[PDB]
Design a protein around this ligand. Sequence first.
Ligand code: 4WO
Length: 150
Amino acid sequence: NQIDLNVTCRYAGVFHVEKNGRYSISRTEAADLCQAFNSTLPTMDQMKLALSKGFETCRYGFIEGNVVIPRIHPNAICAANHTGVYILVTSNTSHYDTYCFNASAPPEEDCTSVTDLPNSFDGPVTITIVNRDGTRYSKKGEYRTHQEDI
Ligand SMILES: COC(=O)CCN1CCc2cccc(N)c2C1
């Protein structure tokens, strides 16, 4: 009963989270996951500011209202070579990564590790935060509030 959460640097408070390193988060689970980080789904405006500070990924993830990929550099295999906040238009499927927004983070790039999941609740799951530099933090808990997600 274990979940890995792979997290990025924060850019103007915005970061990316993947669950178990594969697209596997629903819209409801995404909201709950950000809540566990004392964060919210980003607005489009928040994501655009993050992009302007250096944020890009090669992964679809939820924001408020849409599923997006922030892109700075054109890459043929990431968002069909687009730059900017690329919006997913057409998909059959419902499970992606998520973005989250923490208002208390620094205003620009923060590439320090994440060392806490401050708002997880009591539960039986071993939840491990995995940073890109390999640094890990684990705790026993839960964050999913919808049964359909469990
Ligand atoms: C930003 O989305 C990605 O970089 C997907 C690739 N995964 C690769 C695996 C991994 C492991 C720990 C932390 C992070 N951020 C990642 C990112």
